[PDB]
Amino acid sequence: FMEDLRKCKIIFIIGGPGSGKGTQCEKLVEKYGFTHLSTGELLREELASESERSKLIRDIMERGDLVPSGIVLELLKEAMVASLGDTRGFLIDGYPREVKQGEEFGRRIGDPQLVICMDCSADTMTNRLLQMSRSSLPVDDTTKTIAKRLEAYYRASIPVIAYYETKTQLHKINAEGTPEDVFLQLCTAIDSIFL
Amino acid sequence: GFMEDLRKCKIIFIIGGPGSGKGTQCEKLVEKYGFTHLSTGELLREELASESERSKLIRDIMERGDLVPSGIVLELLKEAMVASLGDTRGFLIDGYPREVKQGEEFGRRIGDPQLVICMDCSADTMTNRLLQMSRSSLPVDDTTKTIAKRLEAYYRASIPVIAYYETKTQLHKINAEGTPEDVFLQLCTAIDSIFL
Ligand SMILES: Nc1ncnc2c1ncn2[C@@H]1O[C@H](COP(=O)(O)O)[C@@H](O)[C@H]1O
Ligand SMILES: [Cl-]
Ligand SMILES: [Cl-]
Numbered sequence: 001f002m003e004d005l006r007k008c009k010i011i012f013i014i015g016g017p018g019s020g021k022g023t024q025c026e027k028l029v030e031k032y033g034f035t036h037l038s039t040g041e042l043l044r045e046e047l048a049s050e051s052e053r054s055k056l057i058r059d060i061m062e063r064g065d066l067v068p069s070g071i072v073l074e075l076l077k078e079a080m081v082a083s084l085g086d087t088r089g090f091l092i093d094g095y096p097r098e099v100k101q102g103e104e105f106g107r108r109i110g111d112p113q114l115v116i117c118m119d120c121s122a123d124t125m126t127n128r129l130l131q132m133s134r135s136s137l138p139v140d141d142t143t144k145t146i147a148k149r150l151e152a153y154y155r156a157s158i159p160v161i162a163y164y165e166t167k168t169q170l171h172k173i174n175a176e177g178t179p180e181d182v183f184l185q186l187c188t189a190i191d192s193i194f195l
Numbered sequence: 196g197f198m199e200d201l202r203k204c205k206i207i208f209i210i211g212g213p214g215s216g217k218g219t220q221c222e223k224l225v226e227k228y229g230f231t232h233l234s235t236g237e238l239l240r241e242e243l244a245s246e247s248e249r250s251k252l253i254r255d256i257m258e259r260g261d262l263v264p265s266g267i268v269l270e271l272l273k274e275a276m277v278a279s280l281g282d283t284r285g286f287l288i289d290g291y292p293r294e295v296k297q298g299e300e301f302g303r304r305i306g307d308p309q310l311v312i313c314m315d316c317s318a319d320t321m322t323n324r325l326l327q328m329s330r331s332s333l334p335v336d337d338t339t340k341t342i343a344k345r346l347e348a349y350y351r352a353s354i355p356v357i358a359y360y361e362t363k364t365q366l367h368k369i370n371a372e373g374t375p376e377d378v379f380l381q382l383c384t385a386i387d388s389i390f391l
Contacts, residue, residue, distance in 0.1 A: 017255060040258030050330040052341040059213055059345050062236030063293045063352060064268050067260030097259040135248050145248040152252060156261070 001081050006110040009034075009089030009194060012096070014160065015118025016153040018125030018146075019175045020182060024118070025093050027183050032190065033088035035080075039095060042075040043067070069101045077109055089194075097156060099163045114193045115164040116186065120175035122150050197277050202306040204276075205230070205285030205390060208292075210357065211314030212349040214321035214328070215371045216378055220314070221289050223379055228386065231279040234289040238271040239263065265297045273305055285390075293352045295359045310389045311360040312382065313353075314371040318346055365389055 011034070015021035029036050046054045053071070060067050080090060092112070096102035105112075129146045130139065164170040171189040175182055207230070211217035225232045239257075242250045256263050276286055288308070292298040302308075322342050331338040360366050367385040371378050 017251065038258070039260055043258070043260060052329060052331045052333070052338050052345075055213075055325075056341055056345045056348070058236075059348055061257065061260075062234070062239070063290065064235050064239060064263035064265075065293060065348075065352075066262040072260050094259065097261055133248060134246065137248075142248055145252075149248075149252045149255065153255065156259075 001084065004084055005077075005080055008084070008087070008110065010092065010110055010112040011089065011114045011116060011190070012092050012102075012112045012164075013116040013118065014094060014157060015175060016120065016125055016150055016157065018128040018150075019118040019120045020128070020179060021093065021118050021175075023179060024183060024186060025091060027179075028091060028186060028190070031187065032091075034091040035083045035087050035089070036091045036093060037076065037079055037095075038093040039072055039075070039097075042072070042079055046075055069098075069104055072101070073104060073108060076105070080109065096160060099159050102160065102163060112169060114189065115170045116189060117161055117164075117170055117172045118175040118182075119172045122147075124176055125150055197280065200280055201273070201276060204280065204306065206288065206306050206308040207285065207310045207312060207386065208288050208308045208360070209312045209314070210290060210353055211312075211371060212316055212321050212353070213345050214324035215314040215316040216375055217289065217314050217371075219375060220378060220382060221287055224287055224382060224386070227383070229284040230287045231276070231283040231285070232287045232289060233272060233275050233291075235268055235272075235291055235293075238268065238275060242271055265292075265300060269297075269300060269304060272301075276305065292356060295355050298356060298359060308360070308364055310386065311357070311364055311366040312385055313357055313366060313368045314378070315368045316371040320372050321346060 013021060013025065025036055028034060043057065047058060048054075053074075057067055057071060076092070076095075083090070096105060126143060126146050129149075130142060133142050133146075135142050161170060173182065173185050173189065177185075209217060209221065221232050224230060239253065242253060243257075253263060253267060272288070272291075279286070292301060322339065325342050325345070326335070326339070329338060329342075331341075357366065367388075369378060369381045369385065373381075
């Protein structure tokens with residue numbers, strides 16, 4: 001699996017809240033047949049399992065503490081190993097959270113052939129999030145809250161983006177257009193590495 | 196108003212390793228004393244379930260397995276305490292704080308605990324209890340290695356904090372190796388000794 005997992009299609013896709021990443025991942029899954037993974041879903045599944053390891057993770061999460069990179073990676077490797085054979089490739093959504101976690105992924109699993117960055121302005125992200133918002137607070141309040149959320153995304157993503165731009169595996173996609181036009185751009189990037 | 200109210204209310208921190216019996220003791224303390232039991236885990240769970248816009252920032256963080264900033268947890272804590280003030284006899288803050296600066300911040304922003312309870316239990320006893328509660332489908336060696344990591348994480352979180360509150364307030368170490376009913380007895384003794 002070491003050699004199999006390594007010599008196989010791995011795409012990271014990143015983007016802030018309101019970038020359209022969720023919907024585009026579904027479209028990509030539908031088109032390409034990729035295995036769509038994310039740490040949040042992997043953590044949720046593990047927590048539902050009653051394993052001793054899920055109890056460790058829960059001890060940590062209940063303190064608001066960081067879940068070590070190595071546990072997250074163990075969960076990815078297992079999901080990836082479970083999907084090999086019947087896979088057209090791996091779409092890892094929202095990963096990595098930090099450069100060192102990405103580096104460790106590279107060493108222990110495989111280097112992604114493509115890191116897609118869903119590039120989008122704060123204003124657009126904010127409008128999409130406002131539209132979906134269920135709060136009945138004043139819009140001013142809701143917008144300040146959304147702003148804080150974008151600001152924290154921007155601070156986590158910057159060094160990651162920089163790392164992959166420095167390694168030249170990053171494709172920036174203009175996530176501002178129609179869903180139709182964004183998807184085309186995504187497929188153009190994917191087809192350009194994997195053909 | 197709330198500021199001086201929060202500063203003068205009963206604040207007890209209770210710290211204990213997994214398998215120490217802390218959870219079940221807290222439920223009994225709440226029932227007996229009419230305290231409000233607060234924990235980070237439960238506060239986080241509740242914020243997330245609220246579906247508030249503010250909650251989505253925490254959801255982003257936790258989906259990466261990233262650390263939730265202390266300010267966010269403190270905010271949620273303060274809000275829980277303000278909401279319970281006037282229909283509670285005191286706060287039992289369970290497994291908090293996780294580091295010293297976070298405790299110092301609590302002290303400045305909310306109030307100083309009058310009592311820190313530490314539920315002392317050996318690693319061997321915590322390990323054995325946690326095996327008794329295990330649903331592991333893995334061999335006992337693998338299973339016990341993961342339990343050892345759970346204790347390691349507890350010791351990391353607890354040692355600096357316990358050492359700090361020893362210097363600052365009343366800290367009572369309870370022998371949690373006993374029966375749960377004896378542990379309850381000792382807890383009640385500790386609490387009664389402080390609140391008069
Ligand atoms: N909360 C979630 N976050 C990220 N991915 C999810 C989530 N729930 C399901 N998925 C997966 O991501 C895509 C969208 O989710 P769904 O269509 O609800 O299954 C699917 O391809 C799922 O495999
Ligand atoms: Cl959202
Ligand atoms: Cl010991």
